[PDB]
Amino acid sequence: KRRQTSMTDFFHSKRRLIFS
Amino acid sequence: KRRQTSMTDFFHSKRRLIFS
Amino acid sequence: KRRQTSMTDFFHSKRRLIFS
Amino acid sequence: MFEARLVQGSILKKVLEALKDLINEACWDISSSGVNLQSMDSSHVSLVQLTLRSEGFDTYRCDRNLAMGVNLTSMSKILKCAGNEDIITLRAEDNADTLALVFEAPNQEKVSDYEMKLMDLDVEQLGIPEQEYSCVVKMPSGEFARICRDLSHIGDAVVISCAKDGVKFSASGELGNGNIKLSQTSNVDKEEEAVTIEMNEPVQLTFALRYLNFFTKATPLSSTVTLSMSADVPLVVEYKIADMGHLKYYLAPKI
Amino acid sequence: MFEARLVQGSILKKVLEALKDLINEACWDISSSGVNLQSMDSSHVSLVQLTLRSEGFDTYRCDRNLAMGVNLTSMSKILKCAGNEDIITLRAEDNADTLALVFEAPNQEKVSDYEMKLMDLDVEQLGIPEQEYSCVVKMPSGEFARICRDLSHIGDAVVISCAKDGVKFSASGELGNGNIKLSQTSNVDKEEEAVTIEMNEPVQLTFALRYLNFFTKATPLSSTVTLSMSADVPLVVEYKIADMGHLKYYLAPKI
Amino acid sequence: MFEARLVQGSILKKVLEALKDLINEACWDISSSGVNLQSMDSSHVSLVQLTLRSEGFDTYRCDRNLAMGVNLTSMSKILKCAGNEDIITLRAEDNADTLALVFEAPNQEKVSDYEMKLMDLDVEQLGIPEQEYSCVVKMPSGEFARICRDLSHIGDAVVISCAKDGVKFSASGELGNGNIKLSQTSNVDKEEEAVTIEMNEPVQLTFALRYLNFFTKATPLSSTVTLSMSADVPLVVEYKIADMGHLKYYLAPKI
């Protein structure tokens, strides 16, 4: 091993604003 | 609610000295 | 009771060097 | 000389497992009619009244009345040393500052002797008036304990609202609210699993859930529990001790 | 108006017992096809995708789509107030900032109403590509959980190496190493207790065991678990929710 | 080459669950006659002697004697990765600083390999004289564990007083005292549930209860336990390992 990647290194990040 | 009462607000308190 | 003894007060102690 | 032989000793164990967390110390009044206890907790918000009648014991002897200052912590510690099927004997003198507890195992070949140091106590006792209550709800003990436990997840306070056809327990906190409605049961197929309500007037009271959670540790004493409520007065939570007596938890409301 | 009646309510409880520890807050997307959830944990190392299809519920009604900002902590707290045999109804409006949860006991005589405060959320959602994986291993869930639990005693990382005839989980730490080799089973006497492997190419990946230990809390949802692995991409740990949908845990590797 | 195949592997697990809390590190002496261990705890108040004879294993091979410096913490951690019905194989070389542990599941289709790092040790071993004891009490292990557990609630010390017709365990603290008297049993209807006493002279000794509570973690190894006591010498608490050997706990008294 070398580096712990994250899910954003593979999948495109969509920001969302949820009001409730 | 408004105020947490105690048992001494309702019942008369009798002090007791117990030796043993 | 008076004093908590140890196992070395009764049995002879043999030191050992274990390599692994 | 005071000597009480109790075959079903586990009861007493339960009695100490329902008290030692709410009250650390208490005066045990021993008389010919049996054992009586009355003690407020350190905050004086709740009170407990224990009654163990003499006919509940297998044998009983009490010449003159005795007031035993007892540390319920140490007593629970001692009762932890007794098995469930153990026959337990309580024995005390008059010129002695201790209480003897003899535990007999069903072998018979194991015998335990415990001497508990009694202590001095400066306690407060309350005069409790013999009264009629507006609402009396008889329900499963495990149900009540479960309800208090669950509503303890919502808020600090519980609103008990009793009508004629149902009893409701509500709770509110910064996560929202919760309502639990128990209806009266048609006890045509049961007796102890039923929820019954005797009402003179509908009652609505608010209580602290931590104290109730202290109260519900008397659940192993009975399969049923009774709630007595009147307007702006302490709630009575009663557990019946079969063939013995009772244990009552009084809780001051939040007016 | 949104209303979902679910007879086997325990499922939902399990759903919240498999999420609230990994993600504290999440957006619940409600549509005519059912319930969808997607949320990374605070470290963005793992992601979760929940799917509860509408046919899984006893009844279902959803006029217009709704995005509910939900605190999974408080929601788990509320679902703790529901029994296992309880029938659970979810109900929400459009101009309301809360979610109603109705718990019905199998008496029928006990009824619970809970109103959960919904919150505002600024979350990140990921675009997950529909793909084929090199290695797909179907195995007992308890077996996987047990393996992760055990290898958690050896090191921080686990090396999953899948061939055609077997799947291996290894771990190394300052106390030494450990190898666990599960062979393919001849499912001539079973179906769910079997270990099967569908391989296009042999795969070797390293993962953090703490996240997997977070994942294995979805074990009560299914008797089986599927592991989808390809080279240098996040692992997919899928639990099937019977007659309902699924719960997927994506975990980024240690390249 | 050293190789020991043991079908009833759980035994070894138990062996490590009865040691790792009292001693963190120990030297395992492997010979043709089997496995021997001797180790004082860090306070040198107690000692442990483990014996696992070679005939107890399913198969056994040992060409030349080996002294394995073992960290019992890590070893217990590794044995935690083995099931109860697992067949366990121990394997070690001569020019290798590790110990191999192979765990085989009853499928057969699951296989585990663990390599434990061995360490350097500067330990003290004691010469234990082969002697006859004044009092030898054979009693149920759970009974002894229960007694130690119970008297642990009273005081720090336990007074074991053995006569010819009974064995007594007493304890005193600032809450009072407690006496537990076990009489000899008429073993006309049993064998293992009995309490027997072989006495040359009546013995009275005082011991620390924490160490005994450490000792009673070997309870799953046997249904019986034997106590060997003589005047002003360490007590021997022996647990028999069926078809295998034994585990002995020596405890220095409070003269």
Curated annotation (Swiss-Prot), chains A, B, C:
Residues 12-20 are annotated as: Interaction with TRIM39. Changing T5A: Reduces phosphorylation by Akt; no change in interaction with PCNA, CDK2 or CDK4; no change in subcellular location. Signal peptide: none annotated. Expressed in all adult tissues, with 5-fold lower levels observed in the brain. Interacts with HDAC1; the interaction is prevented by competitive binding of C10orf90/FATS to HDAC1 facilitating acetylation and protein stabilization of CDKN1A/p21. Interacts with MKRN1. Interacts with PSMA3. Interacts with PCNA. Component of the ternary complex, cyclin D-CDK4-CDKN1A. Interacts (via its N-terminal domain) with CDK4; the interaction promotes the assembly of the cyclin D-CDK4 complex, its nuclear translocation and promotes the cyclin D-dependent enzyme activity of CDK4. Residues 13-20 have a biased composition (Basic residues). Belongs to the CDI family. The PIP-box K+4 motif mediates both the interaction with PCNA and the recruitment of the DCX(DTL) complex: while the PIP-box interacts with PCNA, the presence of the K+4 submotif, recruits the DCX(DTL) complex, leading to its ubiquitination. This is Cyclin-dependent kinase inhibitor 1. The chain holds residues 141 to 160 of 164 of the full protein. Transmembrane segments: none annotated. The modification Phosphoserine is found at S6, S20. Plays an important role in controlling cell cycle progression and DNA damage-induced G2 arrest. Involved in p53/TP53 mediated inhibition of cellular proliferation in response to DNA damage. Also involved in p53-independent DNA damage-induced G2 arrest mediated by CREB3L1 in astrocytes and osteoblasts. Binds to and inhibits cyclin-dependent kinase activity, preventing phosphorylation of critical cyclin-dependent kinase substrates and blocking cell cycle progression. Functions in the nuclear localization and assembly of cyclin D-CDK4 complex and promotes its kinase activity towards RB1. A motif (Nuclear localization signal) lies at residues 1-16. Phosphorylation of Thr-5 by Akt or of Ser-6 by PKC impairs binding to PCNA. Phosphorylation of Thr-5 by PIM2 enhances CDKN1A stability and inhibits cell proliferation. Phosphorylation of Thr-5 by PIM1 results in the relocation of CDKN1A to the cytoplasm and enhanced CDKN1A protein stability.
UniProtKB/Swiss-Prot annotation, chains D, E, F:
There is a cross-link at K164 (Glycyl lysine isopeptide (Lys-Gly) (interchain with G-Cter in ubiquitin)). GO terms for biological process: base-excision repair, gap-filling; cellular response to hydrogen peroxide; cellular response to UV; cellular response to xenobiotic stimulus; chromatin organization; epithelial cell differentiation; estrous cycle; heart development. Changing K164R: Abolishes ubiquitination. No effect on interaction with SHPRH. There is a cross-link at K164, K254 (Glycyl lysine isopeptide (Lys-Gly) (interchain with G-Cter in SUMO2)). Changing I128A: Complete loss of interaction with UHRF2. It comes from Homo sapiens (Human). This is Proliferating cell nuclear antigen. HAMAP family: DNApol_clamp_arch. InterPro entries: DNA_clamp_sf, Pr_cel_nuc_antig, Pr_cel_nuc_antig_C, Pr_cel_nuc_antig_CS, Pr_cel_nuc_antig_N. Homotrimer. Interacts with p300/EP300; the interaction occurs on chromatin in UV-irradiated damaged cells. Interacts with CREBBP (via transactivation domain and C-terminus); the interaction occurs on chromatin in UV-irradiated damaged cells. Directly interacts with POLD1, POLD3 and POLD4 subunits of the DNA polymerase delta complex, POLD3 being the major interacting partner; the interaction with POLD3 is inhibited by CDKN1A/p21(CIP1). Forms a complex with activator 1 heteropentamer in the presence of ATP. Interacts with EXO1, POLH, POLK, DNMT1, ERCC5, FEN1, CDC6 and POLDIP2. (Microbial infection) Interacts with herpes virus 8 protein LANA1. Keywords: Acetylation, Deafness, Disease variant, Disulfide bond, DNA damage, DNA repair, DNA replication, DNA-binding, Dwarfism, Host-virus interaction, Isopeptide bond, Methylation, Neurodegeneration, Nucleus, Phosphoprotein, Ubl conjugation. Phosphorylated. Phosphorylation at Tyr-211 by EGFR stabilizes chromatin-associated PCNA. Auxiliary protein of DNA polymerase delta and epsilon, is involved in the control of eukaryotic DNA replication by increasing the polymerase's processibility during elongation of the leading strand. Induces a robust stimulatory effect on the 3'-5' exonuclease and 3'-phosphodiesterase, but not apurinic-apyrimidinic (AP) endonuclease, APEX2 activities. Has to be loaded onto DNA in order to be able to stimulate APEX2. It is linked to Ataxia-telangiectasia-like disorder 2: A neurodegenerative disorder due to defects in DNA excision repair. ATLD2 is characterized by developmental delay, ataxia, sensorineural hearing loss, short stature, cutaneous and ocular telangiectasia, and photosensitivity. Residues 61-80 bind DNA.
